């Protein structure tokens, strides 16, 4: 039911993207689409099926391609995830990526809350003890350190995707379906 107009998204979200751009040296490999010729990495599109970068995200905000702000968050993490996948853990570009992600995680919650959401945190806080997703880079002995996306429940009334753990509590029941605060 809630529709987000482009200028409302751009106004709220763009300062989170500028916070990334401000990071120097860290944003510099993220400022333009990876060019595997220039960078000497001819196997790049063998590994990254769905590239993403700061300029494409800015252009998506600037031209109204996101309908709702979790689509922006998903692209931010697709960019991060691509880079943590392709580059080795010891590489400069990987380490820069982790810094950008730290910066993002600290910026996104207040801004998502200004847009009516619970928070802006994509991934669960830790892996589940053992007994895809638009940001997961696709693929055509393990180690238990994967973080899955925090699952959602939609507000029945406005259509906002809210996290189950942010809005559903152990002592509250919603027989007619979840409704968010304001809306309520």
């Amino acid at each position: 039911k809630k529709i987000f107009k482009p200028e409302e998204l751009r106004q709220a979200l763009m300062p989170t993207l500028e916070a990334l751009y401000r990071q120097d040296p860290e944003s510099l490999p993220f400022r333009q689409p990876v060019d595997p010729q220039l960078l000497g990495i001819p196997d790049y599109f063998d590994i990254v099926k769905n590239p993403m970068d700061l300029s494409t995200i800015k252009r998506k905000l600037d031209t109204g391609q996101y309908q709702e702000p979790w689509q922006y968050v998903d692209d931010v993490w697709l960019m991060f995830n691509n880079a943590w996948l392709y580059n080795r853990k010891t590489s400069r570009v990987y380490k820069f990526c982790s810094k950008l992600a730290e910066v993002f995680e600290q910026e996104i919650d207040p801004v998502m809350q200004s847009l009516g959401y619970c928070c802006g945190r994509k991934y669960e806080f830790s892996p589940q003890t053992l007994c895809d997703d638009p940001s997961q880079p696709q693929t055509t002995k393990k180690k238990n350190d994967t973080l899955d996306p925090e699952p959602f429940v939609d507000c029945k009334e406005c259509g906002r995707k809210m996290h189950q753990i942010c809005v559903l509590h152990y002592d509250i029941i919603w027989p007619s379906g979840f409704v968010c605060d304001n809306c309520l």
Binding site: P29, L39, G40, I41, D43, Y44, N87, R88, S91
Partner: peptide
Amino acid sequence: RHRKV
């Protein structure tokens, strides 16, 4: 496997 050069 290549690396950013």
